[PDB]
Amino acid sequence: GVHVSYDNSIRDADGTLVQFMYGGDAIDITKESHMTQFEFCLDNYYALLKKYNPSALIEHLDVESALKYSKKTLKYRKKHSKEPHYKQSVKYDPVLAKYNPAKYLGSVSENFQDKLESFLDKNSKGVNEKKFRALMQLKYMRSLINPGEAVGIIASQSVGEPSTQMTLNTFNVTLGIPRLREIVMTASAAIKTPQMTLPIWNDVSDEQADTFCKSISKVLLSEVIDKVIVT
Amino acid sequence: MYKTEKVDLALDPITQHFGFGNDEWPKEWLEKLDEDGLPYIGTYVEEGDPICAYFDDTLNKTKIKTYHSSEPAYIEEVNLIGDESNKFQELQTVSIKYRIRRTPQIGDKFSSRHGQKGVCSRKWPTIDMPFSETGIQPDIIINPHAFPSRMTIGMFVESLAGKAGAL
Amino acid sequence: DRLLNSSDYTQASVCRECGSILTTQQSVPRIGSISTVCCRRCSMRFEDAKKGEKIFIDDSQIWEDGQGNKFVGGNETTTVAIPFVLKYLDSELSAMGIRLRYNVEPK
Amino acid sequence: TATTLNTPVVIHATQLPQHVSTDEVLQFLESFIDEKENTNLSSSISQLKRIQRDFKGLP
Amino acid sequence: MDISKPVGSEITSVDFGILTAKEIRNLSAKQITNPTVLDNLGHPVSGGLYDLALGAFLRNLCSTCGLDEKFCPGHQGHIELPVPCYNPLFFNQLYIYLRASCLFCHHFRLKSVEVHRYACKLRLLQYGLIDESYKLDEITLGDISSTLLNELKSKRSEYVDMAIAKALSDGRTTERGSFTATVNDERKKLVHEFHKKLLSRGKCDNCGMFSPKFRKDGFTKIFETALNEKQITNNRVKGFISTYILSTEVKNILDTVFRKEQCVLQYVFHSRPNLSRKLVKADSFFMDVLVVPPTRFRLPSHENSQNQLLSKVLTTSLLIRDLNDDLSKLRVIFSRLMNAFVTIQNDVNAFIDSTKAQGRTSGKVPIPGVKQALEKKEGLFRKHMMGKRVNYAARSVISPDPNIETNEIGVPPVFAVKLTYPEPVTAYNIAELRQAVINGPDKWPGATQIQNEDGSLVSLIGMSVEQRKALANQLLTPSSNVSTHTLNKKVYRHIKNRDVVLMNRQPTLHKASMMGHKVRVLPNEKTLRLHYANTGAYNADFDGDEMNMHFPQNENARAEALNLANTDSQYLTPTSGSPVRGLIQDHISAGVWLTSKDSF
Amino acid sequence: NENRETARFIKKHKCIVRVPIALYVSLAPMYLENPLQGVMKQHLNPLVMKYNNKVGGVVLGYEGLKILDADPLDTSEKLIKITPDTPFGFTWCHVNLYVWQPQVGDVLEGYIFIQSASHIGLLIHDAFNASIKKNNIPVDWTFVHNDVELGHWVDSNGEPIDGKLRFTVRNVHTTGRVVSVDGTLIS
Amino acid sequence: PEDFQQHEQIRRKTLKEKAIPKDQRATTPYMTKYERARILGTRALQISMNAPVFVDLEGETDPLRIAMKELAEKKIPLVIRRYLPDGSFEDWSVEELIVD
Amino acid sequence: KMQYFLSTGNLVSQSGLDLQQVSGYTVVAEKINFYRFISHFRMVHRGSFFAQLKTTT
Amino acid sequence: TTCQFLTKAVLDNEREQLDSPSARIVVGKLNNVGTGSFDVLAKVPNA
RNA sequence: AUAAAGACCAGGC
DNA sequence: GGCAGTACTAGTAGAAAGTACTTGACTT
DNA sequence: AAGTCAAGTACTTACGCCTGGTCATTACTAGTACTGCC
Ligand SMILES: [Zn+2]
Ligand SMILES: [Zn+2]
Ligand SMILES: [Zn+2]
C-alpha cells in the first residue's frame, strides 16, 4: 500500500506516513544513471538541451527562489565544516523540504551539488557555465519519481529477486536468506550470533588490545580442569 | 501414438444393444459405424465423430456415443468382450484402439544422448541450408555457443567417432 | 479489470438499510405486475404490522413469496458490481454466526 | 427497461409539497407543451393534452 | 464485463456484526427439522436440508423465488436448536469472562473505580485522542467511603466530557472519531491488559466473598470446581454480615453480569463511537438457531457437502425434542439427557470446527464443514480471492524468432481464432469491421461473436456466409427504441497487430516479469514467439519452457499496457540501475568480428 | 429488552402539486457538449405520465433544469463526473415536477367510458383510468342490460346516470399497466 | 424531506471544505504518466462510444492512438481530480499541464 | 481385497506393519521405452514420507 | 490465521474502509496505489 | 444434446 | 406341504522449527 | 494472599504454475424373500 503521494511523501493506504520523502530525493533508480556523468553530459550538451527544451520550462517554474536558499546553505556548510550534527544547528534544512520539488528550479539535493561544484572546480571549459548548470539542475528536476508510483511493491520485489540468485550456504557468520529472512520475519530478538563492532583507540597497540580480549573472554570452570579423580 | 478406449454399455434386464433398430433415424453417420454397431477399421475419426452407436429399448432410440479428445485418430482394431457363463450373454464391453499420426513439428524436445535438451525454432528448406563440398546439407544444426556453458564435449568427440565410423 | 471483471464480475443486488446481498430476493408477482425485487430481512409480515387513524399503503409495497405469505417493507436496494465469491463469503461466514453489512453510496 | 441507464439510482423529494392552484397548473401545461416538441414522448404529450383540455374546457 | 451496464453504486466502508435470535427468526423462509436428504423417486423432500424453498435444485423450480436455477441466487435457511450454546470461536473469550464475574453480586471481582477508569479511558480511546488518556490516569485528588468515589466518577465524567468537547470543538477529532494504527496499538494493548485482569486475583472487592472458579475441560464442557475448607468457612461468615452443572445457566449468569456492567463492555467491545446506542448482551454470541447456506452452495456432486453433519445435528435434535416430550407425561432418562446436551453441543462444534469433535477411528481426514473448508491450505482465500482463474488467455511453448523489433511477438492462427475482444461499432470502423463480420471466426481476420444492443449474445460458429453478409449489411443501424439508442452493437474481434498482449511466466519475481507487448500474427505453427533480448528479462530459456499469455479486455487496459507496462519503458529495472536487455550470444559473437579491423 | 429492540428496528430504516426532487443519473458521450438534452431524453421523457414510487403519483412535466455542479465556485461551463469504468457521467441535479397524486378519501370527478354489468370504467379528466367493483354498487341501484346491442345503470331515483360522475377514491393501483383508481360508494 | 436536506448541506459544505481554491494549489504542474495513461485510456474509451471529436481524423481506426493525437493537440474536455490523503483535492486541467 | 491393494496402492492393514508410510507402493508402468522398462525393474525408493521432510542429508 | 483474526475483528466491531489493496481486491473500486488514487472529471460547456 | 469435487503415483519448468 | 440352506438387499460402523498464551510453583 | 517469573503446550506454520494417469463409488453384517429336499 505504501506509495508516493502528491505531497511528495511515501505513506500507507489509510493515510499514515512512512517517510517524508523517497530516499530524501524522490528520484527513481530508472533515471539516476547519467545524473553523475558530468563529463558525458558536458560532451553531449547540445542534444540534451534539444530534448529537455529548457526554453519552454520557465512559465510555470520559479528559478531564483531556490537558488538563494541553496546559496545560503552552501555558504554555512563550508563556513563550519568542522563538527558533525551533534553540535550543528538546524536553522537551514535541505533546500528541497520547504520548497516544491517539481516547481522550483535549483532546489537540488546535497551530495549532487557537492560533486557538481567540485567537478566545476576541477576544470575550465565552447559552452558557458550558467547554462550548463541550468540544464544540469533542470535534469535533476526532471528525474523525480512520478507521484503515484507503486513504491512498496518495487521495494518488495527488488529485495527478493536477487535472493533467488544467491540462495546457498556460504560464500565467519551466518549469511544469505537464512539471515535475510531472520532480520525481517523472525521478530528479531536475542540472535544466534551477537555481533558488535568496536573502533579501537589510536594510542593503543596490539599489546593493548590482546589484554582487552583476554579480559572479557569468558572462561568457565571447565577450561581449567585437566583431570578429575573422584574416589 | 496409440490411445485405447474402453466403452461399457448399459450404464437387471439389458436394454442398450449395439446397432440399430426399426424406426426412423437420421442418416449421414454410416461412414464410420457398421450395421452391427461397430466402427470400420481405418476410418478417420476427429473430435466429434461417431465411435459406437447403441439402441435402447426404454426409449426406442439409437443414440451415438461421441468422441471428444485433443487430436484426430485413426482406428486400428476393435476388440469384443463377453463374460463367460453357462447361459448366453450378449456382449456389453468393447475395447477399441486408436492411432495418431504424430508428424514431428517444431517445439518438440529433440536431444541427443549427452544431455543437451533443446527445441525446434523453425524448419529451414534445404536450398537455404548450408551445403558441404560434397553437396550434402546437414539436416540438423545445433548452437555452438551452448558448449562453453553446457560443457558437453561428448557431442564433439563422439561426432568424430560417428563420422569416422560411417566412412 | 482482469482479476474481477473477467470471471467474478456479477451485478448482484445490495440492500441499503440492512446492507446485505444474500437476503434480498425477487417475489412472485401477478400476471400483470412484473419486475419485483426487495429485501426480505428488514421486511415484516403484513398481519403483524398494523396500526392517528388506520394507515393504508399503496399496495405496491406489498409483496408475496411463493409459499403464499404476505410481507411489507424492505424495499431500498440497488444493483452493485461485486465478485460472486464475496457473496459466497457472506453466505459461508453467516453460517459461523458473523454478519457482514455493506453501506452503498450514496449514504 | 428497469436499468440504471433509464432509471435514476437515488431519488429524493427535495422540499415538502407546496400546493399549486389550477392557474399554475394551466400555465405549467401550456408552457412545457410548446417547449417539448421543439419517439415515445409523443404518446406522453398526447396525454398531457387531455389534462390540459379538461381543466380548461369540456371534451 | 460489458461497459454497456454501468454500476450505480460502490462500497466505501464495511462493518461487521453478529447474528442474534430475532434476526434469523425473520431472515430465513422455512424451518427444516428432519435429517433426511431426499426421499425415493428423486425429488426434494419437505423440511429437509435440500428443501425446495432454499433455491432451485435438480431442474426443479424454487418455492421461495419461483425461478429456475440460473436466475435464483438461493435463499438463506435455518435450523432450530433446543438449548442455546456458545461458538467455538468465542469460547476462548467467554472462558475469561466466566472466570471473572462474581456469582453473587453479578459484578466483576474488582472495585468500581478502576473498572470505570478503564471504561472511561477506552471512552477516550474510541476517538483519535491520545494526549489526555494518560492525564486522566493521574486524577486521584482528594476503607473508602462511597461519597468521594461517586464524586470521583463525577469529576472523571466532567473531565472526559470536557476533553471530547474541546477535541471535537477545534479541528482535532471528527464526530465519527478518528482511526489510525497508533490508536489501535494502545487499544489492543489496554484491552489485552483488561484480559491480564482479575484472573490472578481472589476475593471480590465490591462484595466481600470469593466465588467458585471454573476449569476448562479442553474442548466441550467448561466445568465448575469444588470449594475447599478455607472457603466454606467464608460461606459461613458471609451470612454473618469438577462437576457438570448445566448449559443455559451460563447464559443466566452472563445476562445479569452484562447488565450490571453495561457501560464498561459498551466501550470494550466497540472500536468506534457507538452512534446507534445499542446494548451488548449474552444473546449475541450465544447461538440459538443455526444457519445453513442456500442449496446453490450445497450441490450433491454422495454426501459431498455439510449434509452428513447437519443431519447429525438434526438427528440429536429430534432425539432431544422427544426427550422433553417423554418427560411431559411423567434414572437413565436423565443421564441420556446430559449426554444428549454434550453430544449436541459437540455436534454443532464439530460442524463449525474440526478440533473439538470426539471423532472415531482414522477417518482419512474429516470433512471440512465451514471453517476448515474456508482454509484448504491455510487460507483458501488464495484460490478465489488473491489469484483468480482469468479468462481470455492463452498458454503455449515459446520459440525464438528474430526480425521482430523487440516489442512485438508472434501469435499462431489457433490463438487468433479462439481469443477475442469487444469493439463497439462506430463511424471509424465501418470499413474494417465489416470485413471481420463477413470473414467469420475460422478464417483470419474475422469476428466470432456479435453482442446485440439488448444484451443477447450472438455467435457465428455454424452460420453461413449469406447470414454473415446479412448481419454485415444490418450492422451499423440505429437501435430499436430510444431507451437503447445510447449504444450500438459491440462486435467481438479476435486479434490484430494493433492490440496489446501481456506476457507472464511463473514464477514471476520482479516488476519486469510481466511486460505488455504488441502482437503480430504468424501463420506458421501453433507455438508462441519471442525475441532474443526479450527472453533475458523474463529469466527464461528455450529447453521446453512454458509461459502464459494474457489479453486485456478494455480500451483503458490497452492504454496502460501499451504506455505504462510496455517493454521499451521497462528497459531499466528499478533494482540497481542495470538494464536487463541486450543480445546474449549470437549477435555479440558477430560483433567482435564485424566491428574488427580485419574486415574490409 | 423489547423497547430496546424496537429502537434497533426503528434505526434499521434510518390534486396536482409541485415538488422539487434531487436525482442522480448518467449521461451519454454523444451528449457531452449538450448534457441537459441528454438527461431529458434519457430519464425525463420516459418518466412523464408514468407513476413514480418516491413522489407517489403521476408525473405531469418538469421545471427547473438545474444540473448540480461538482466544483462549488459564475460561468455556464460546468463539469460532470465520469465513472472509471464507463464513459457515462453520474451527476446530481434538481428539478421541479407537477405531480398528480390522488389519495384515499379524496373526492374526484369522472367521465363515463365503460358501463358493464358489474364494473364502471371511467376516465378522470380524460387521461387516467378508474374502476368501481360490484361490491361498491349501492343496493338501491339496479343494472339493466340492452338486448339490441353494453348496458346502463339505474340510480335510486329510477333514471339513467349522467356522463359527469363524481365519486371518492378507494385505492390507487400501481403495479398494473396504467394507474387505476378504485372508487367508494358510502362514507 | 428534512433529514436528507441537512445531509445534502453537509455533503456540499464538506465538499466545499475539501475543495482547495485555484490560487492555493501547490502540487507538481507536469503531466504524470499515470494521468497520461488514464487520459489516453479514458478518452479512447470515451471516443469509442461515438463521442464528439475535436480534431481531424483521417483514415485512423485505433481509438488509443486517437486519444494520443487528442492529447498531442490538447482538445479534450477533461480535468484531472488529484486527491490528497487528508481528503482535499485539486482540479488540474489537462490543457494547463505540460507534456514531454 | 488384494486387487484393491494393487489397484489403489495404499495398504489397509490391521496390524499396522513395519514400514512408516501408508501409500506409494505401486507404480503405473507406462511401458513407453525399453529404458523405462528396465528402470522400473531396478528401482530404489527411500520412501514417500521423506518427500515431506525438508532436510538436506 | 483468518479465523483467529475474524474473532478479534467482529468481537471489537471493526469497521474498515477497505483502503489496503488486499482489501481493495475483495470488492474494491479500482485500487489505491498507482492510477487508483486520483479520479477523472470532465468539463462540459453548457450548464 | 453434457461433464463436478477431493485422495495417491509418475512427469515438465 | 413344512423345514432349512443359500444368495440378494438395505442399513450401519513415526518427523522439520518458532512464538506467544495459559498456568503451577515461589517468594515477599 | 497476591504479584512475578519460569515451564508446559497448542497449534499455528512452509516455492510459483502446469500436464498426465488411476479410482472408487464403503465393507461388515444381519434381516428376509426365494429355492429345493424330505
Ligand atoms: Zn434490508
Ligand atoms: Zn429461490
Ligand atoms: Zn462480588
* Residue E62 annotated as part of some ligand binding site: yes
Find the DSSP H helices in H1-57: 2-8, 34-41
- In angstroms, what separates the C-alpha of D12 from chain F's closest C-alpha? 5
Cα–Cα distance measured from residue B33 to residue B27, given in angstroms and rounded to the nearest whole number: 11
Q: What angle do CA E169, E174, E175 make, to 5 degrees?
A: 85
Torsion angle of the four alpha carbons C82, C84, C88, C91, in this order, in degrees rounded to the nearest 10:
60
**What residues does D19 pair with on adjacent strands?**
F17
Cα–Cα distance measured from residue E513 to residue E502, given in angstroms and rounded to the nearest whole number: 10
CA atoms within 13 A of residue I1's CA, in its CB half-sphere: 5
- For domain D11-59, which CATH number applies: 1.10.3720.10, 1.20.1420.30, 6.10.250.3390, 2.40.50.140? 6.10.250.3390
Q: List the single residue in E5, E9, E482 with the smallest CB-CB distance to D9.
A: E9
Burial class (CB in 10 A: 0-12, 13-18, 19+), C51: exposed
For residue I38, what is the DSSP state?
A: S
Amino acid identity at E526: K
CA atoms within 13 A of residue G100's CA, in its CB half-sphere: 13
* Residue E263 annotated as part of some ligand binding site: no
Strand L close to E378 by CB, under 7 A: yes
Other CB atoms within 10 A of residue F180 CB:
15
Cα–Cα distance measured from residue E72 to residue E430, given in angstroms and rounded to the nearest whole number: 40
C1’ K16 / CA I4, Å: 25
Among G42, G81, G93, most I C-beta atoms within 10 A, so best to mutate, is G81
For residue E519, what is the DSSP state?
A: -
For the residues of chain B, what is the DSSP string, one character each? ---EEEEE-------EEES--SS----S-TTTB-TTS-B-TT-EE-SS--SEEEEETTTTEEEEE----SS-EEEEEEEEE----SS-----EEEEEEE------TT-----TTS----------STTS---SSS---S----TTSHHHH---HHHHHHHHHHHHH-
Among A2, A3, A5, A6, most G C-beta atoms within 10 A, so best to mutate, is A6
- In angstroms, what separates the C-alpha of D13 from chain E's closest C-alpha? 19
Q: Hey, which residues 113-132 in chain F have their CB within 8 Å of chain D?
A: 125-127
Cα–Cα distance measured from residue A77 to residue A95, given in angstroms and rounded to the nearest whole number: 13
Burial class (CB in 10 A: 0-12, 13-18, 19+), F39: buried
C1’ L3 / CA E134, Å: 23
Residue G76 grid coordinates = 479534450
Write out chain I residues lying below 8 Å of F84, CB-based: 29-30, 39-40
CATH class for the region spanning G1-100? alpha beta
For residue F177, what is the DSSP state?
A: S
Chains that touch H (3 or more CB pairs under 8 A): none
Residue B157 grid coordinates = 568427440
CA atoms within 13 A of residue E166's CA, in its CB half-sphere: 7
Contact G49 F30 (CB under 8 A): yes
Residue E265 grid coordinates = 463492555
Q: How many residues does chain I have?
A: 47
Q: List the single residue in F23, F24, F46 with the smallest CB-CB distance to D6.
A: F46
For the residues of chain A, what is the DSSP string, one character each? --EE-TTS-EE-SSS-EEESSGGGT-B-TTT-SGGG-HHHHHHTHHHHHHHH-GGGSSTT-BSHHHHHHHHHHHHHHHHH-SS-GGG---SS--TTTSS-TTTBTT---SHHHHHHHHHHHT------STTHHHHHHHHHHTSBPPTT-BHHHHHHHTTTHHHHHT-SS------SHHHHHHHHHS---S-SS-----PPPSS--HHHHHHHHHHHS---GGGT-------
The answer to whether C53 faces chain F, any CB pair under 8 Å, is no
Helix or strand holding residue I43 (H, E): strand I39-43
Cβ contacts below 8 Å, chain C against chain F, sum to 27
How far, in Å, from the CA of E241 to the mean position of ligand 3? 14
Method used to solve the structure: cryo-EM
Phi, psi of B151 (to 5 degrees): 60, 40
Closest nt to E200 (CA→C1')?
L2
Contact of A101 with A107, CB cutoff 8 Å: yes
Cα–Cα distance measured from residue D27 to residue D52, given in angstroms and rounded to the nearest whole number: 10
Counting CB pairs under 8 A, whether chains C and E reach 3 or more, is yes
Phi, psi of E555 (to 5 degrees): -65, -40
Query: What distance lies between CA I16 and its chain's CA centroid?
Result: 8
* Residue E85 annotated as part of some ligand binding site: no
* Residue E102 annotated as part of some ligand binding site: yes
Contact C82 I6 (CB under 8 A): no
Strand L close to H49 by CB, under 7 A: no
Residue A173 grid coordinates = 557468520
Contact of E129 with E163, CB cutoff 8 Å: yes
Residue F94 grid coordinates = 434538481
Cα–Cα distance measured from residue E503 to residue E493, given in angstroms and rounded to the nearest whole number: 20
Q: In chain E, which residue's Cα lies nearest the Cα of D1?
A: E483
How far, in Å, from the CA of C42 to the mean position of ligand 1? 4
Closest nt to E541 (CA→C1')?
J13
Q: In chain E, which residue's Cα lies nearest the Cα of G67?
A: E559
Question: What CATH number does the domain located at E392-418+496-570 have?
Answer: 2.40.40.20
Nucleotides of J under 7 A from a protein CB: 1-10, 12-13
Q: In chain G, which residue's Cα lies nearest the Cα of I45?
A: G77
The answer to whether F153 faces chain D, any CB pair under 8 Å, is no
| SS3 (DSSP) at E528 | strand
Kindly provide the resolution of this structure in angstroms, with one decimal.
4.0
A204 in the Ramachandran plot: left (φ > 0), alpha (ψ -120 to 50) or beta?
beta
Q: Where are the domains of chain F?
A: 15-102, 103-187
C1’ J13 / CA E548, Å: 12
Contact D15 G4 (CB under 8 A): no
Nucleotides of K under 7 A from a protein CB: 14-16, 18-23
| SS3 (DSSP) at G72 | helix
Counting CB pairs under 8 A, whether chains F and D reach 3 or more, is yes
Contact of A152 with A18, CB cutoff 8 Å: no
Helix or strand holding residue C81 (H, E): strand C77-83
Cα–Cα distance measured from residue B106 to residue G4, given in angstroms and rounded to the nearest whole number: 69
Tell me the CA distances in angstroms from C46 to A118, C49, C63, E27, F3, one per residue in order.
88, 5, 9, 15, 21
Residue E26 grid coordinates = 425473520
Q: Strand B52-56 vs strand B16-18: parallel, antiparallel, or unpaired?
A: antiparallel
Q: In chain C, which residue's Cα lies nearest the Cα of D8?
A: C78
Counting CB pairs under 8 A, whether chains B and A reach 3 or more, is no
Phi, psi of E271 (to 5 degrees): -100, 15
Amino acid identity at F117: A
How far, in Å, from the CA of E104 to the mean position of ligand 3? 6
C1’ K24 / CA B80, Å: 77
| SS3 (DSSP) at H24 | coil
C1’ J13 / CA D19, Å: 78
Strand L close to B149 by CB, under 7 A: no
Strand K close to H52 by CB, under 7 A: yes
Asked: is A26-146 a CATH 1.10.357.120 domain? The reply is yes
Residue A165 grid coordinates = 540468485
- In angstroms, what separates the C-alpha of E521 from chain B's closest C-alpha? 16
Name B50's Cβ contacts closer than 8 Å, sequence gap at least 6. B29, B32, B33, B39, B64, B65, B66, B67
Nearest to G28 by CA among E402, A72, H33, A145: A145
Contact G85 A60 (CB under 8 A): no
Query: What distance lies between CA A220 and its chain's CA centroid?
Result: 45
Domains of chain C: 1-106 (3.90.1800.10)
- In angstroms, what separates the C-alpha of A122 from chain G's closest C-alpha? 34
Tell me the CA distances in angstroms from E138 to E76, E132, E157, E159, one per residue in order.
53, 10, 14, 12
Give me the domain span that covers residue B13: 1-103
Contact of G89 with G20, CB cutoff 8 Å: yes
C1’ L20 / CA B72, Å: 18
**What residues does F90 pair with on adjacent strands?**
F81
* Residue E120 annotated as part of some ligand binding site: no
Asked: is E419-495 a CATH 3.30.1490.180 domain? The reply is yes
Ligand lying closest to the C-alpha of residue E74: 2
Query: What distance lies between CA G72 and its chain's CA centroid?
Result: 16
Q: Where are the domains of chain G?
A: 1-100
Ligand lying closest to the C-alpha of residue C66: 2
Contact D16 G5 (CB under 8 A): no
Q: List the single residue in A13, A148, A149 with the smallest CB-CB distance to I21.
A: A13
Q: Which residues touch strand J (CB under 7 A)?
A: B 48, 66, 68, 117; E 301-302, 304, 364-365, 376, 506, 541, 543-546; H 9-10, 23-24, 27-28, 45, 48, 51
How far, in Å, from the CA of E34 to the mean position of ligand 2? 20
Chains that touch C (3 or more CB pairs under 8 A): D, E, F, I
